[PDB]
Amino acid sequence: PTIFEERHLKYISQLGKGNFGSVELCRYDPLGDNTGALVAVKQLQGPDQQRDFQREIQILKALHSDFIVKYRGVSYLRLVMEYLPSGCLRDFLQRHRARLDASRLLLYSSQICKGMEYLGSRRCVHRDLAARNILVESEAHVKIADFGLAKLLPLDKDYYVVREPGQSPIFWYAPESLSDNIFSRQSDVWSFGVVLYELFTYCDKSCSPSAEFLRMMVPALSRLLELLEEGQRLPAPPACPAEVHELMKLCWAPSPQDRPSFSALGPQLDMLWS
């Protein structure tokens, strides 16, 4: 049930790639007759990376929420998760933009905020919150995924300092992450603000965090950190409700201690409805 025999995991396709592993679509088919259930299987494509992967597995196994991708088990080596055929929220928002209204965007925002609130209560920093890392379960249900960069906060420290700088697109990182590699539940809040912006632009590539920050934009990271320190922010998405934009601005407070908490954002997102 929680142990998946390797010989019964039948390879179908690649669901994703992202340093230093792959997510594959597999069918767990012990009968070998193509009637078994579909599963998403993560594996490393390294000694420290192996320690990193086993930590990811321990983090995800211990998470139990409707807004967090379900852990199924392991195969001995590989992490088995539930398969969400709708895939990432980024690509989903692009294919269904003429269908999802403000209410719907607000429902996804609420569900993600509930998921982050729960991660925070687990002393877990996600570090990579973005629409491409969030999965769609159904039309009215999103779940947070990709815990490959997630960190557990020690009981006496509310932040974590990363040794080597990030390998993710710089446009989701908080100023303190860009300058000092400081990651905390508050830097996750900053990233959540960028997710709100992604939602309200339906992840449109022309006004995307990368496209729009680059045109507002010496190394690029230092230049982005300069824009941000001056108080420059991403513009309100086209037709964005003022209140949603005011929330993104709060998430984007310069000092981590001034950003609203996930528990304060939730009732506010729910009040705007869905």
Ligand X SMILES: *CCC(=O)N1CCC[C@@H](Nc2ncnc3[nH]ccc23)C1
Least distance in angstroms from the C-beta of 38 to ligand X: 9
Determine if residue 23 is labeled as part of a ligand binding site.
yes
Burial class (CB in 10 A: 0-12, 13-18, 19+), 239: exposed
Determine if residue 16 is labeled as part of a ligand binding site.
yes
Query: According to CB under 6 A, which residues from 68 to 127 bind ligand X?
Result: 69, 81-84, 87-88, 90-91
Which of 10, 16, 61, 223 lies at the binding interface for ligand X (CB under 6 A)?
16
Nearest to 89 by CA among 80, 81, 77, 97: 97
Is 132 one of the binding residues for ligand X (CB under 6 A)? yes
Is 63 one of the binding residues for ligand X (CB under 6 A)? no
Q: Cβ(153)–Cβ(129) under 8 Å? A: no
Determine if residue 22 is labeled as part of a ligand binding site.
yes
Looking at the Cβ atoms of 29 and 82, the one nearer to ligand X is 82
- Contacting range for ligand X; rule: CB under 6 A; set: 2-10, 15-23, 168-176, 259-267: 15-23
Least distance in angstroms from the C-beta of 220 to ligand X: 23
Which of 9, 26, 40, 59 lies at the binding interface for ligand X (CB under 6 A)?
40
Q: Measured at CB, which residue is nearest to ligand X?
A: 16
Helices (H) and strands (E) in the chain, counts: 9, 11
Name every residue whose Cβ is closer than 8 Å to that of residue 123 and which is 6 or more positions away in sequence: 152, 153, 154, 155
Cα–Cα distance, 174 to 176 (Å, whole number): 6
Which of 15, 63, 130, 269 lies at the binding interface for ligand X (CB under 6 A)?
15
Quickly list DSSP for 129-174.
--GGGEEEEETTEEEE---TT-EEPPTT-SEEE-SSPP-S-GGG--
Which residue shows structure tokens 């269904």?
96
48 is catalytic: no
Determine which one of 128, 156, 158, 180 is catalytic.
Answer: 128
The backbone region for 34, taken as left when phi is positive above 0, alpha when psi lies in -120 to 50, beta otherwise, is left
**DSSP assignment letter at 81:** E
Least distance in angstroms from the C-beta of 99 to ligand X: 18
Which of 63, 106, 107, 145 lies at the binding interface for ligand X (CB under 6 A)?
145
Is 241 one of the binding residues for ligand X (CB under 6 A)? no
Looking at the Cβ atoms of 38 and 207, the one nearer to ligand X is 38
Measure the CA dihedral 237/240/246/248, to 10°.
-50
Name every residue whose Cβ is closer than 8 Å to that of residue 136 and which is 6 or more positions away in sequence: 84, 86, 87, 88, 89, 92, 142, 143
Token pair of 112 as six digits: 């993600």
Looking at the Cβ atoms of 91 and 270, the one nearer to ligand X is 91
Show binding-site residues for ATP: 15-23, 42
Binding site for ligand X (CB under 6 A): 15-16, 23, 40, 69, 81-84, 87-88, 90-91, 132, 135, 145
Residues serving a catalytic function are: 128
Show binding-site residues: 15-23, 42
